[PDB]
Design a binder for this molecule. Structure first.
Ligand SMILES: CNc1cccc2cc(C(=O)Nc3cccc(C(=O)O)c3)c(=O)[nH]c12
Length: 198
């Protein structure tokens, strides 16, 4: 059972967030949540499909990452009875460990996928999907959007995202991945930036 594995992996991440995300007391793990989601969007860029990424700090202290790539495949996976996107959002395999870590450590996560003319949406709570991915509407755009509300059971002390921390790494990432265009917007004060290196 994939379902059994999935919940074991999630539970493994909650019990040992240090080895997956970093220190949970000093801010580093909290911001590493953003960078992990961002790194997935960059993969879609490196793969040649995404060109703009927008990172938003929301005023309710969640962060969203939007890409204009293909959008995570929505097809019920041939292997596990749920959408391929749910697999990517929930399956652990530190070998092959990725964005499930963020899902596990978020009190809530919102996933919106635009592809093949359709908008698909799923909500997760502590990594657990409220329902299967479902079509909520129609669109002519493509891409993936992950917004996450970090668990305040997991994170102490530094619980609010810092603009400058996110600006510094995003600037570095566009530098290292020349050609990727990344926008950062703060909804708390209206501050924004655009990082591209060519
Ligand atoms: C903010 N953005 C994102 C956050 C978190 C995860 C992903 C995953 C993906 C992806 O997995 N994209 C992809 C698209 C089409 C095909 C395949 C495939 O492997 O067959 C993969 C992506 O594009 N953005 C992401």
């Amino acid at each position: 059972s994939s379902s059994i594995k999935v919940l074991k992996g999630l539970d493994a991440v909650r019990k040992r967030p240090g080895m997956y995300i970093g220190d949970t007391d000093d801010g580093t793990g909290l911001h590493h949540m953003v960078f992990e989601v961002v790194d997935n969007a960059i993969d879609e860029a490196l793969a040649g499909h995404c060109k703009e990424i927008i990172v938003t700090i929301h005023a309710d202290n969640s962060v969203s990452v939007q890409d204009d790539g293909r959008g995570i495949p929505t097809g019920i996976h041939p292997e596990e009875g749920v959408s391929a996107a749910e697999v990517i959002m929930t399956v652990l395999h530190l070998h092959g460990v990725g964005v499930s870590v963020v899902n596990a450590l978020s009190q809530k996560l919102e996933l919106v996928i635009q592809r093949e003319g359709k908008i698909h949406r799923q909500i997760y709570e502590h990594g657990v999907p409220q329902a299967p991915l479902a079509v909520t509407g129609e669109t002519e755009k493509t891409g993936t959007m992950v917004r996450f509300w970090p668990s305040l059971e997991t994170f102490t002390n530094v619980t609010e995202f810092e603009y400058e921390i996110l600006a510094k790494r995003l600037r570095e990432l566009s530098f290292l991945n020349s050609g990727v265009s990344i926008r950062l917007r703060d909804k708390r004060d209206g501050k924004e930036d655009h990082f591209h290196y060519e």
